[PDB]
Amino acid sequence: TFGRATHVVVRALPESLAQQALRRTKGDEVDFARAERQHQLYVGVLGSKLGLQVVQLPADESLPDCVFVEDVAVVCEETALITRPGAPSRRKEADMMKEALEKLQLNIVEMKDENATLDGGDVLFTGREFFVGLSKRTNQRGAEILADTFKDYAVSTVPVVDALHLKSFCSMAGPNLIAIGSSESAQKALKIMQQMSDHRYDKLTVPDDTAANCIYLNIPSKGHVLLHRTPEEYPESAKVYEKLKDHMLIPVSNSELEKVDGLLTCSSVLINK
Template sequence: MGARRRRPHGNMPGGEPMGRGRAAGGAFSAASAGGGRASLACPSAVPAARAPRPSPPSPACSMAGLGGGLAAFGRCTHAVVRALPESLCRQALRSAAGPEVDFARAEREHQLYVGVLRSKLGLQVLELPADESLPDCVFVEDVAVVCEETALITRPGAPSRRKEVEAMKRVLESLNLNIVEMVDENATLDGGDVLFTGREFFVGLSRRTNQRGAEILADTFKDYAVSTVPVHDSLHLKSFCSMAGPNLIAIGSSEAAQKALKTMQQMSDHRYDKLTVPDDAAANCIYLNIPSKGHVLLHRAPEEYPESAKVFEKLKDHMLIPIANTELEKVDGSLTCCSVLINKASEL
């Protein structure tokens, strides 16, 4: 079961679940699983009764599954991406053995992805150079979580990826964001485990992200409730879910995905809509709210996941942009992995 951190109060480590049970029906227009809420442990927190949840502001947030509270949800002005190193083909981390990445094809697919962000959607794209000593560096999502004017520089769960944060920190500083660095050696956090809905955060507890990492995220973004979600059989939480629109969560059909969904239902006070797709990998998509174009959704190409593409086609109020990700998927890459999306208020 997941755990819940509420603002402004919390429990000390080892505290009992706090708060009253949910009303029947739960969130996501589905029945909620039973159980209470446990707060995230925090050294500075003291035991307290549940307090009314503060109303969230209207943020501009991103972690390559962009949030932006309510009316501003999905607004974006900038994208940070990174070129592919050739070392990715043989040295990138992967959860299972498989065919080698075709570098030329991977580069073409990535260039098309970046081209959509820059040319089709009009974002200001900041592209970091590849670093051959960092074979996973194209997956920029994992090294930063951006919400409003604050950027949390993470401590990735894989030690081989920790130097990736240096270039990301520099580029986010150039945007005059407030930088918070995760320096606790007991903490790990990958951005791929962080789902921001515009109202709250869900943080996957996975092979790459631990409880202490979730606590530091909660301390960084104090205006939002944070719930932890156990992740089994997948690399990250967003390996099988993402935001597909305001109030809309795309979710895969696997047992692991559906179990995580039930946990999120249980943890949340809000009723979200859900969009269930047959393929877990296809549930990772990128929603943007572009003033000149309206609702935009980047999703996996029909030739990759035809049945899931049919589900996305039902979103008649979205501008649908299919994106191929055949090669980076071989090393556990998803669409959200390859960008950090940022909304600079001064640019609106």
């Protein structure tokens, strides 16, 4: 049942996303056209190729980051936690997301606590438990609210250092497999998480930390499927995923979104209805 999904929520790219300062774009210039193509292809893999029912939300120019829907909602089974993003400028994205999730007839829980913040990017759901990164975007209060929302699942926190989100350097690659970056900080984070759990997780170390962020899915007629970064964007990391012969590997470009800190998981919210 882990990795199973029927629907996926995504959101169109606003032009304001490519109209940001160099300091915010890591010094790189965003090719808005290529970014839209990369998103189109990304959605095409999840929709047409994998058969998921796609819910495409309209772009909002006032919300330059509205494309990264993962941050505004954490879904588990039939319950959806509408988060309170660490960045105030993104708090409004919750409106559209909540509306879509309600339309899907899911149990809605909203994070209103003025003292709580949490980005979905800091949430790693293994299928057995939650690991929540304490970062500049997610605080202890936010983690506690998530734990209170999914009471039947263990929830543990991990410090996020030298990275924006917990998943800036990890994500699930299989039923009991955690893709983890090779950096010193990434390996340390995983060690801390593992120490918290009573379950021994397997791990796949990837040379490029951001390449550790991938999307795993269990499709009925295909089996284990994994969307990962391309050999062109991350040569050193692409070959590592090839070690999963039981997985249907799918290279997905994302060079432009990464310029504004968008990784593979950031652009979609998976739902199993």
